[PDB]
Symmetry: C3
Subunit: 157 residues, 3 copies
């Protein structure tokens, strides 16, 4: 059941428009509805740090630094700049994708690698875990107080 009018196009599934037309797929003056389905084959235009077609000429120093740093490789670059060097390549009002979510994260680092001899760093993406460990002479504990996830550090023994 496909219907078109001055306000747009609407497709009502074999069974029904559902509560509040939630089961309706449409493109009308009121926007878009996917009817409980998905929007596939879509990209936001966002790139990952380290990706091939980065334009260093229009970049800020911070963005270029991250683009070239392996510690950031793979993280989504929410700040790529285009021509004028002021306007975001990708505008705020652009649908984000699951692939953009997969590259979301922050970098964690330390000047020393445990049992190592080099600096340390890794990415903390969705569902990654960071653990603060007690060590010789130091007790590290956690507790969520009034919403704050507090990690306390004290002398042991």
């Amino acid at each position: 059941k496909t219907e078109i009018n001055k306000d747009g196009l609407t497709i009502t599934p074999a069974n029904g428009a559902g509560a509040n037309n939630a089961n309706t797929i449409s493109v009308t003056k009121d926007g878009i509805s996917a009817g409980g389905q998905s929007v596939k084959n879509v990209v936001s235009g966002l790139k990952k740090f380290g990706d091939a077609n980065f334009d260093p000429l229009t970049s800020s120093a911070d963005n270029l630094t991250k683009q070239n740093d392996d510690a950031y490789k793979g993280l989504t670059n929410l700040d790529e700049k285009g021509t004028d060097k002021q306007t975001p390549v990708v505008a705020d009002n652009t649908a984000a994708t699951v692939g953009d979510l997969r590259g979301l994260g922050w970098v964690i680092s330390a000047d020393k690698t445990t049992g190592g001899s080099t600096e340390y760093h890794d990415q903390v993406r969705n569902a990654n875990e960071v653990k603060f460990k007690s060590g010789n002479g130091i007790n590290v504990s956690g507790k969520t107080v009034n919403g704050r996830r507090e990690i306390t550090f004290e002398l042991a023994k």
Copy 2:
């Protein structure tokens, strides 16, 4: 006053108030893509599940995905790596629109081997707009400072 045009390139709906600027108010599905005319895309899902959800098939899962699926520490966090029947192809492809609900489940897990004032290990989730504070304790001074971009937390004897 609204009109719907169909031409070689696609379908464009111009609201009763004009195409706006750069067709910004326009709602369209054309060869160049889709415009929601400053509005939203509603009644949409990406197919992403939260860890701990039902209908998770343990036999197509990697050890890491399954562990998180069964660990209460991860419960409710969005699962971005669910695999399909072939055990390698993601159930949700990259080029799929993400939803606000997917965002609501984003987060990492913070833990410690001890609970402050307690006697068991600690863990909680850090989602959007959650705060993590590193506190000084007896004999140790914990301070922070943003330097050269880095949020640096320093630890020293008091």
Copy 3:
């Protein structure tokens, strides 16, 4: 580029071709929407940032009001603005999220002391920000990823 609307809905086939599975086809049908490798632009989810002047204190939850009024949280995406009932979120789960929403995602990092200063510390850790755990006088701080866990260890030097 052939555009057409029939009983099934809207389908736009590029001059070039459909694709390995009609991946280049742009469509609006019973199965949902396909962007044919393009973007969805001029779109908003309706999410606001904390500290936005348009916020309503009267319908706010205790927690949300707290964050709306804590400058440490300013700019971060507000994923829990409540409507009248305060029992329902202004923005529903099944609403496409935007790149602008991603840009405001982040967590607050804080400490009760500012290194070399004399006040409390706080900043936001958004996507691609870096958090470093520093060794100080007497304490050695090291990192290592073990069995997937990003572990930071504290011990007396």
